Amino acid sequence: EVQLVESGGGLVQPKGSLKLSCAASGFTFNTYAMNWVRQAPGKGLEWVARIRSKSNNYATYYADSVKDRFTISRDDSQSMLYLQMNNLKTEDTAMYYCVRHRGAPLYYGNGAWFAYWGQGTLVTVSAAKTTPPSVYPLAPGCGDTTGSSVTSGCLVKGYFPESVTVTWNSGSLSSSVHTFPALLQSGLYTMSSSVTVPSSTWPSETVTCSVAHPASSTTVDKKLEP
Amino acid sequence: DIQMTQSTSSLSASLGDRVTISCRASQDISNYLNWYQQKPDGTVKVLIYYTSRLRSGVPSRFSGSGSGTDYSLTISNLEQEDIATYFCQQGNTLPWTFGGGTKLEIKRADAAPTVSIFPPSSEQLTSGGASVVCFLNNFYPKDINVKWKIDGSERQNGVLNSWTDQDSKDSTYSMSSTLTLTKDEYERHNSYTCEATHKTSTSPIVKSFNRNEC
Numbered sequence: 001e002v003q004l005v006e007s008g009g010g011l012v013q014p015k016g017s018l019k020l021s022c023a024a025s026g027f028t029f030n031t032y033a034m035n036w037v038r039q040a041p042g043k044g045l046e047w048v049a050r051i052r053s054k055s056n057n058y059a060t061y062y063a064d065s066v067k068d069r070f071t072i073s074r075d076d077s078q079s080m081l082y083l084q085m086n087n088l089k090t091e092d093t094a095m096y097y098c099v100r101h102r103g104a105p106l107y108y109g110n111g112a113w114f115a116y117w118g119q120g121t122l123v124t125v126s127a128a129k130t131t132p133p134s135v136y137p138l139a140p141g142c143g144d145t146t147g148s149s150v151t152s153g154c155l156v157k158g159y160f161p162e163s164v165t166v167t168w169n170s171g172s173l174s175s176s177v178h179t180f181p182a183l184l185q186s187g188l189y190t191m192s193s194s195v196t197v198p199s200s201t202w203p204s205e206t207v208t209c210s211v212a213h214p215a216s217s218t219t220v221d222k223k224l225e226p
Numbered sequence: 227d228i229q230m231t232q233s234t235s236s237l238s239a240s241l242g243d244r245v246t247i248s249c250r251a252s253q254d255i256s257n258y259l260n261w262y263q264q265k266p267d268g269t270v271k272v273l274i275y276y277t278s279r280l281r282s283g284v285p286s287r288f289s290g291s292g293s294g295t296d297y298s299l300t301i302s303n304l305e306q307e308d309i310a311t312y313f314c315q316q317g318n319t320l321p322w323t324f325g326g327g328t329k330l331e332i333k334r335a336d337a338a339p340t341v342s343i344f345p346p347s348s349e350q351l352t353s354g355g356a357s358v359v360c361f362l363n364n365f366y367p368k369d370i371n372v373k374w375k376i377d378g379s380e381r382q383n384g385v386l387n388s389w390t391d392q393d394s395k396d397s398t399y400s401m402s403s404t405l406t407l408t409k410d411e412y413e414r415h416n417s418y419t420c421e422a423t424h425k426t427s428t429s430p431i432v433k434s435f436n437r438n439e440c
């Protein structure tokens with residue numbers, strides 16, 4: 001029901017700027033306070049900023065780490081939340097989540113909590129430049145074959161920043177797939193993905209990985225061949 | 227500011243177990259203590275608010291207790307779908323602060339990995355590089371060792387290994403091992419094998435190919 005769709009995340013250099021957006025739907029936006037919450041990779045959650053409703057004159061509050069650098073705002077007519085981020089620093093690198101505040105305190109208590117969360121938009125503050133990945137297929141060699149199943153893959157090499165998305169057969173073949181978390185090797189990331197299918201249905205029948213790296217506007221498909 | 231501490235950063239439990247996750251605040255927070263679940267894919271939802279109130283739609287096996295500075299989340303009768311990281315958060319005074327998180331692994335029966343090996347691609351070779359890749363799939367427990375043998379000799383330089391998160395449906399893990407060489411290096415050897423050693427077997431699980439037959 002409640003949807004909070006963040007966008008605007010990307011690579012930016014130190015001291016740079018970036019504006020995030022969040023498109024809300026499925027609730028009466030203008031009666032709720034809204035927040036941004038962030039999560040530095042491998043770390044815990046950190047509350048960033050709050051903006052209250054129009055009935056509270058859109059009062060805003062900020063964590064001390066972002067106070068005076070970040071500006072939270074909203075457009076009730078478009079049900080949008082925004083975070084303008086200026087003078088960015090390395091330690092602002094994080095997934096940024098749009099969050100709806102708990103509702104009526106007379107029912108839910110005065111204490112603050114965060115009732116609905118978006119999926120997040122990733123912000124990377126780094127001196128390193130955008131680099132598209134090299135994508136390579138992974139098919140079995142001629143030597144040997146199992147009768148029951150076969151495993152195929154795609155290797156995604158030497159990109160920056162995170163992240164990429166790999167899908168198999170336009171999403172069709174799903175959760176037979178494993179996604180291997182990306183590793184940073186010498187300033188650049190590498191990850192891989194695998195799919196397992198019945199051996200009869202391949203190669204008679206096509207299997208394709210689509211690799212998206214939004215940060216460099218790249219999308220590469222590899223049809224897997226013996 | 228109010229510092230929130232979850233002294234256990236990770237634990238492992240079986241299906242049906244009681245799981246207790248503790249949170250300590252640096253000052254009294256007047257019961258304004260909330261718990262969140264973050265699934266391995268990053269999806270966050272609130273479980274419990276105001277110490278013990280259950281969020282509508284959250285299963286009753288989640289409960290909370292405590293007061294003052296000390297609080298606890300209990301998961302009774304642990305279920306498969308409860309693999310996640312659990313965070314506490316005080317809502318008493320700004321800035322609103324979170325604990326560092328407690329990661330929950332769910333046990334399952336030991337499982338041997340399914341191994342697959344893959345030669346480098348034509349495309350990569352034309353670029354002057356060579357990555358050999360090994361997948362170890364659907365194994366448990368998480369600890370596992372992968373060795374690369376090139377013409378019988380162990381190779382460690384150029385190896386990178388990545389483990390999946392625990393699988394939400396069957397609690398197994400998977401890992402990829404990637405050996406990246408220059409095309410020159412690749413070409414001067416024939417036999418490439420990856421050997422998986424895991425507690426489920428006294429001898430390694432092995433997959434191999436020969437460059438001149440590929």
Ligand SMILES: N[C@H]1[C@@H](OP(=O)(O)O)O[C@H](CO[C@@H]2O[C@H](CO)[C@@H](OP(=O)(O)O)[C@H](O)[C@H]2N)[C@@H](O)[C@@H]1O
Pocket residue numbers: 031032033034052053056101102103104105
């Ligand atoms: N039934 C009320 C309830 O709806 P619910 O969320 O349970 O569906 O809460 C609604 C929202 O209430 C307002 O919540 C605001 C915070 O998000 C709060 O502002 P502050 O916390 O910043 O002071 C405001 O006072 C609440 N009225 C409510 O509209 C529904 O009537």
